[PDB]
Design a protein around this ligand. Structure first.
Ligand SMILES: N[C@@H](CCCC[NH3+])C(=O)O
Ligand SMILES: CC(C)[C@H](N)C(=O)O
Ligand SMILES: [Ca+2]
Ligand SMILES: [Ca+2]
Ligand SMILES: [Ca+2]
Ligand SMILES: [Ca+2]
Ligand SMILES: [Zn+2]
Length: 316
């Protein structure tokens, strides 16, 4: 924990070199003291005990294959911290510079990642369905966003409430991806999903139906799986957000896009000032309408475009 701030260099999951903020005290640790109360990255050592051990490195160079997932979890956590601070004036997930902790090499062959109420956790994937999941900046930011949601709206992880929770994570994960600006898109998880299949992703915001997700309230999943479809019905909200930002005509409804920055401002406002644990899609629409009204005014294009976007996905 206590030491002097250093800068190491390493290679991520996709093979790019980057600098990472580390801490030196006998070993060099993945502990970034430059952001809030720190970003801390841990090795779960293929087990499921959390957090595992604060990541220690003898020489401050992180180019081993074992190193790569840790490099990206640490680095992309910094990027995501930077987005929230610079764009939304938010200091870490709780708004009070809480330490951000992530563990990598969780379990063996684990095809997923998550926020467990206290930290981020990333599987290495089985190498067929996924490569290590911290390799996707949209994935890291999706997970950290769950932390932001837990401390703000606190959307319950079930049915419509839980689909909004998910969509907020896909929205901000994407807006983070655009912020770092590498090869950004409106898809989710493309950098780490199915190496060896080109062009696919876990979910699409631009066309949720591409991967079996609803793009209209009329096609909402009403069953029991996936906590009442939280990763499925998120499609409806993802599509609304895509339309607000990028524009389009969808089931005959025309939406004039207002761009990514304003989408982010509206949904961050909604998230932090209007939504509640029990909010449903209709309540989301009104929160987004009030937010856009606060920011741009009653008669703005921005308000009209929020309304059209929700009309287009069948949410009144
Ligand atoms: N993150 C999503 C999809 C991950 C893929 C499931 N192996 C979920 O937990 O449902
Ligand atoms: C894989 C990731 C984006 C998330 N835990 C699901 O969805
Ligand atoms: Ca090393
Ligand atoms: Ca991308
Ligand atoms: Ca993406
Ligand atoms: Ca793929
Ligand atoms: Zn999620």
């Amino acid at each position: 924990i206590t030491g002097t701030s250093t800068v190491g260099v390493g290679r991520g999951v996709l093979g790019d070199q980057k600098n990472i903020n580390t801490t030196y005290s006998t070993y060099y640790y993945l502990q970034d003291n430059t952001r809030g109360d720190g970003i801390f990255t841990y090795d779960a050592k293929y087990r499921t005990t959390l957090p595992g051990s604060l990541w220690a490195d003898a020489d401050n160079q992180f180019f081993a294959s074992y190193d790569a997932p840790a490099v990206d979890a640490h680095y992309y956590a910094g990027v995501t911290y930077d987005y929230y601070k610079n764009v939304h004036n938010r200091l870490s997930y709780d708004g009070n510079n809480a330490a951000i902790r992530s563990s990598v090499h969780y379990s063996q062959g684990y095809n997923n990642a998550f926020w467990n109420g206290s930290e981020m956790v990333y599987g290495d994937g089985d190498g067929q369905t996924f490569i290590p999941l911290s390799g996707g900046i949209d994935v890291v930011a999706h997970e950290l966003t769950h932390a932001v949601t837990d401390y703000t709206a606190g959307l319950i992880y079930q049915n419509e409430s839980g689909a909004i929770n998910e969509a907020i994570s896909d929205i901000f994960g994407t807006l983070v991806e655009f912020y770092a600006n590498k090869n950004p898109d409106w898809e989710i998880g493309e950098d780490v999903y199915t190496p060896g299949i080109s062009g696919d992703s876990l979910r699409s915001m631009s066309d949720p139906a591409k991967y079996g997700d609803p793009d209209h309230y009329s096609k909402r999943y009403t069953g029991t799986q996936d906590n009442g479809g939280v990763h499925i019905n998120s499609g409806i909200i993802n599509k609304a957000a895509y339309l607000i930002s990028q524009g389009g005509t969808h089931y005959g409804v025309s939406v004039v896009g207002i761009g990514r920055d304003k989408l982010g401002k509206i949904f961050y406002r909604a998230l932090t000032q209007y939504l509640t644990p029990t909010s449903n899609f209709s309540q989301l629409r009104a929160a987004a309408v009030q937010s856009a009204t606060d920011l741009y005014g009653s008669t703005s294009q921005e308000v009209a475009s929020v309304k059209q976007a929700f009309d287009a996905v069948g949410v009144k």
